[PDB]
Structures are given as structure tokens and as C-alpha cells.
Amino acid sequence: WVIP
Amino acid sequence: WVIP
Amino acid sequence: DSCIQFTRHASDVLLNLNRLRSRDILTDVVIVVSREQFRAHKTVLMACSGLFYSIFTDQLKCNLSVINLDPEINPEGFCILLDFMYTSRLNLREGNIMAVMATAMYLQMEHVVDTCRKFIKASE
Amino acid sequence: DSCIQFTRHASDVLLNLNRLRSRDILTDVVIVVSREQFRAHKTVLMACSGLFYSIFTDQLKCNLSVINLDPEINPEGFCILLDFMYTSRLNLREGNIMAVMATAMYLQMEHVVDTCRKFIKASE
Ligand SMILES: O=C1Cc2cc(Nc3nc(Cl)ncc3F)ccc2N1
Ligand SMILES: O=C1Cc2cc(Nc3nc(Cl)ncc3F)ccc2N1
Ligand SMILES: [Cl-]
Ligand SMILES: [Cl-]
């Protein structure tokens, strides 16, 4: 999961 | 396009 | 093999599937979550959820155009997860995390259940 | 928004859509390319091809379960492009590049047409  |  | 691969292809396919959903093109099922209705593509739901995979591989249920979810399921939680299926983006907030995690457990979306557990653990 | 994003989601969705295709699950169209038949999902074809997008958004054609392509289309070229749609990988070879490029122009798959043009230019 990432900060888009 | 890339070499997978 | 000796194939070449287009890096952005899968993301571009998903973006187009979400554009078809927006425009109600070739949607073939309505998911009912109490008083709310959500239109979607059975194939996208099966590709994202172990529960929908089991439903639409069943010889009788594969033919239904309406699926009613358990009344304990929160429509907002379902809406957030449906948007995730079609976009890869999860709108996880302090005010919705418990409903999202409970809905992802029911729908059998293991990666979502995993990030919810981690965010809850961080708050404790 | 304040969303989080699962990097591998789109690739995982496409992998599952290809597994449904393999297992002939919820395929809803047969594409006929002379003597050959290919089963697929209309939504995946529309998401990848400008030609299929135009076909399945047409009020009469959206309801057909069989689509016959132009007899000049090579079945091997179509097969390579259908595999690309479902996997992001293109099996481009000296012996098939002309048929693949001609099929991608017909199907309106601009990124494929672009890589074929570049590989042809490199050989000249
Ligand atoms: O957490 C999850 C997400 C998820 C999706 C699927 N989907 C499919 N699985 C297979 Cl093997 N082939 C085709 C499919 F559409 C099954 C189980 C699970 N569990
Ligand atoms: O080279 C290409 C690939 C391609 C795909 C599509 N697909 C869709 N386009 C839109 Cl805007 N919404 C939903 C779709 F399924 C249209 C044109 C083109 N041309
Ligand atoms: Cl997931
Ligand atoms: Cl393309």
C-alpha cells in the first residue's frame, strides 16, 4: 500500500 | 514497454 | 517466453472498466445492501472478492441479476470497497475503518483486511 | 482525496480475469476470425480495443453473442493480441510482427501499433  |  | 510487456496496461484496463461502470455500460448485476443498490460487472466483483468468486461460480447463482448481501453489511463500507475494486484506491478514514474492515472480511478481500488491521493496530 | 492505493491491485485483477477466461467462466462472446473461434469477456475486449468499444456500445451489437471479424484478419495475430489484452504481455516475433501490427490497427490498440512501428523501424 502507498500514498498515490 | 519493458522486458518482464 | 520472449514477450515484451506494457507496464501501464493493467492500470489502463481497470480505468476503462471503471469508466464503463460510471456510464452503466454492460453492468450485469445489482448488489443490494439493505436500502441501497449498486450496479457492477460480475467479472470485476469475482476478480476482487472471494465471496463473489464463490457466488458467480455456483451453477444456480451465476444466473442471478440481483444479489442481496447480509443485512449487517454497511452500504457505505460496501461503496468504499466497490470503488477500491475498480480503482485500487481505498478511502480509509477513522470514521469508516471498522465498517470497511467488517465488509472486507465478509467479501473475502484479504489485502484490504490486512491494511485495516495494521491501521487499527497503529491507533492502539 | 486522502485514499491509500494497493500497487499490485490492477495486475492482480487482470490475472484473475485471465484465470476466468482460461476456465471459460462468464465469457459472453465468441469472436470468429475465419475458421477460428475465441471466447472472451465483452468488458475486457472493450477496455483494450477501440473497435470493440465501438461494437459493444452500439445498441444493436451489444446484444450479439458472436462477432465475425474481417476475413483479412489473421487468427494467430488476433490470438497474440487477445493474450496481450488479458496479460499485458505481447509475443512479438519477426515472423508475426506484420500480422500483429495489421490486427492492432484494425482493433484500434494504439500502444501495440506504436511498439510494432518502432520494432519495424529498428530492422530497416
Ligand atoms: O482476498 C481474495 C481476493 C480473491 C479473488 C478471487 N478471484 C478469483 N480467484 C481465482 Cl483463483 N481465479 C479467478 C478469480 F476471479 C478469489 C479469492 C479471493 N480472495
Ligand atoms: O487504443 C485504444 C484502446 C482503447 C480502449 C477504449 N476503451 C474504452 N474507452 C473509454 Cl474512454 N471508456 C471505456 C472503454 F472501455 C477506447 C478506445 C481505445 N483506443
Ligand atoms: Cl483485497
Ligand atoms: Cl494497446
Task: Write out the three cell numbers for C73.
Answer: 453489511
Look-up: residue for cell 463500507? C77
User: Which of D6, D13, D88 faces C6 most closely, judged by CB atoms?
Assistant: D88
Of C65, C52, C54, C92, nearest in space to C76 by CA:
C92
Look-up: residue for cell 489484452? D85
DSSP H stretches of helix in C1-124: 9-22, 42-48, 50-56, 75-87, 97-107, 110-123
Look-up: residue for cell 472498466? C17
Task: Write out the three cell numbers for C70.
Answer: 447480509
3-state secondary structure of C32: strand
Buried b (16+ CB within 10 A) or exposed e, D33-59: beeeebebbbbbbbbbbebbbebbeee
Q: Read out DSSP for D46-80?
A: HHH-HHHHHHHTSTTGGG-SEEEPPTTS-HHHHHH
Determine the straight-line distance between the first and last CA of chain D, rounded to whole angstroms. 48
Pocket of ligand 2 (CB under 6 A): C 16, 19-20; D 46-50, 53, 108-110
CA dihedral C38, C40, C45, C48 (to 10 degrees): -90
Cα(D3) to centroid(ligand 4), Å: 28
**Residue in chain D nearest B2 by alpha carbon:** D89
Q: What is the number of domains present in chain D?
A: 1
Q: Which CATH number is C80's domain given?
A: 3.30.710.10
Q: Could you give the CA distance from residue C48 to residue D11 in angstroms, rounded to a whole number? A: 11
Strand partners, D29: D40
Of D96, D74, D98, D19, nearest in space to C3 by CA:
D96
Look-up: residue for cell 441479476? C65
Look-up: residue for cell 450485469? C28
Name the B residues in 1-4 with CB < 8 Å from any C CB: 1-4
Q: Residue A4 and residue C89: Cβ atoms within 8 Å? A: yes
Q: Could you give the CA distance from residue C55 to residue C49 in angstroms, rounded to a whole number? A: 10
Q: Could you give the CA distance from residue D39 to residue D62 in angstroms, rounded to a whole number? A: 16
Domain ranges, residue D115: 1-124
CA C110 to ligand 1: nearest atom: 1
Residues of chain A contacting D12 with CB distance shorter than 8 Å: none
